[model samples]
Target chain A: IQRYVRKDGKCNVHHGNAETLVFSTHAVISMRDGKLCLMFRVGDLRIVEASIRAKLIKSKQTSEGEFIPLNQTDINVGYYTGDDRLFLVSPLIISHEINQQSPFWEISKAQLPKEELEIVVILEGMVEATGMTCQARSSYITSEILWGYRFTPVLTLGFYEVDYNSFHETYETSTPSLSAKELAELANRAE
Target chain B: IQRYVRKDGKCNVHHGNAETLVFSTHAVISMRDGKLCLMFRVGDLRIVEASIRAKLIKSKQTSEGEFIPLNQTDINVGYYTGDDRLFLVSPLIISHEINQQSPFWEISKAQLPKEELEIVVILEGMVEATGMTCQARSSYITSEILWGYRFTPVLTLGFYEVDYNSFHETYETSTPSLSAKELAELANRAE
Candidate 1:
């Protein structure tokens, strides 16, 4: 299950901008049971199909899920159905007829009128800078501990305009496949 | 060399809280020659020495470098000199043991009674969340663009904290290298 904690040290049950969010997205594959279940962001669940293409085609909700044309001003909060991972996204528009043959698709790119909105993410004890060009300009507000560490750290990534790229992929199996007894034993050792 | 841009979109060479810092560090590996030169914030240059141990040392004064240590109640800025590369780190006490090591070696855990500090890296485009624990949480602030119908996607040693455990003894020839444009051309094509 996914749990979010706000900056003021409050717990979040559903997906909301807590000061930070802490939750594990689980991808479990079992050969003996012949089953696979992917879980993320609490109550958000999906079954892994053979391939990403096949799964996307099967994920049809006649009246439930909607395929809306992304515009230059839409902000989205959702997960990758193929992998069951959540992300907060904004849309943009591009001028040139660039190629979109890769998995990291460029949805659109437009020079917005102005900075109309700001985006943020909180993962329990971790704080992040969001919606800007730089991380130093960003802020993190969380009360929980990340990876059991004392203070939260800032993460740095590459540039946007010069080298604009995104990553999306899927895996077939899960390792460290521990049993109930093994999980309990590991937890005891940590204490 | 490090550069910053203010809200007015002007390039400024000064470091302060108001300036936007670049997140990705640049490493100039001399492909033409066999040597590597690294450039980062602060006015310093790092050279990979041609010793039997392949010792990488810093030639500039620590005070002139560009990294800020976040663990200090007052931020302390400096660069980390590893054997092969110079890592531009944020102000943070990564762990208990690392906190007690160099850069921060001047300060003791007993002196600062706080369990943790807030630190982060500001990459040019994306912001990531990290903390005293060794993990990063990232958020994408920009928008995505689609290319119409097209689409596409895409060791280590130890010690000194900087010192490697000699037990591994994976050493290469002590050949000294140099930087040249031909090497850059070779690297461009090699990849």
Candidate 2:
């Protein structure tokens, strides 16, 4: 498993089922410490078996029981900055098949058909922290991290229909000044 | 003295001061009669003597006295398609000097310096009519054109500080697939 260090000193190992993945692209502009920055990237959300099992293992090691289960079905949210291409190894999940019990439902809506379903990820705000705690309220989605006052990054996922024609056109035409290596470096740095 | 005929039978002549122009480019997506269209064009707003004088002349011609003066200051709004170059023959208006009575003030803010002031045009919605009246309420800016059950085209103007560096980069790089003549023809057909 690859380990990535967040802005906070806390580190997280890449852990999730890669088979069940839903992805989308978004245009994100952010303000951090009064400086404005923009990021164009693809967001990946994967359905995983209960993350409570993972939390149990961590609790056993740390003896702190730090992880609190937010939803019955856990989702692994991944960020990819390199390209627009998305690969699905298994059958896609239909909107009607998604149940409210699944956290994936938070980022999926029934109105959109299986093919048209998409997620729009927005980096709401960021604060400096080590380990972050995520909470889903009825009103808004939030995440908290522990560390010095450096950067707190809050992200929201919205559901929409994919305009395939425009999406492909945009993807093909856009030539980002930053290379994939540079973008991955930036993504890793920001994350 | 140039007049452009809208799709409706009613006609409106272009009227506004040529001097004191502030313009910017906007990607305008419009929907009329359930059909959607897009226009990439430059929008111009210019300070003019009160339009009341023009309205008064129209009122005199119609003999209905339907014109009501809304603002002491008048502005000429112009739209240009095809070219990225902008030419100003006179001194530019500073943001601070824009008074509250003018609609331009709604789009201008104090933080932006005078020289960098720019306008962004957004087509809000449209309705079918003979000639449309415009109103700028606190909540929304609206325009009403006259005709039968044809269409209503509402547009909003936004002001911002132009980043000269990025502006030129974007302007030079963007080559609209539609020519100015094609755009004009499309605009006429749509109207």
Off by over 4 Å in 2: A1-33, A36-38, A41-191, B1-117, B129-191
lDDT of 2 by residue, B1-191 (tens): 33233467333332222311222122222323332222222223321111110000000111222121111112222211211122322211111112232223322112112212112221111112322222110100111111111111212112222223222111222223342344456789999
Structural RMSD, model 1: 25.9
TM-score of 1: 0.18
Q: List, residue by residue over A2-91, the lDDT tens digit for candidate 2.
A: 112111112232222241122212322222222222222222332110011101011112247555333222222221110111111111
Chain A of model 2 scored by TM-score: 0.16
| iRMSD (1 decimal) for each model | 21.2, 26.9
Residues A1-191, model 1: lDDT tens digits: 33243578543432211211222222111222231111122111101111111000011111212221110111111212312122222111101111222111221112112112211121111122332222111111111101111111111222111111111112343433443334446679977
The TM-score of the first chain in every model comes to: 0.16, 0.16
DockQ, per model, reads: 0.01, 0.01
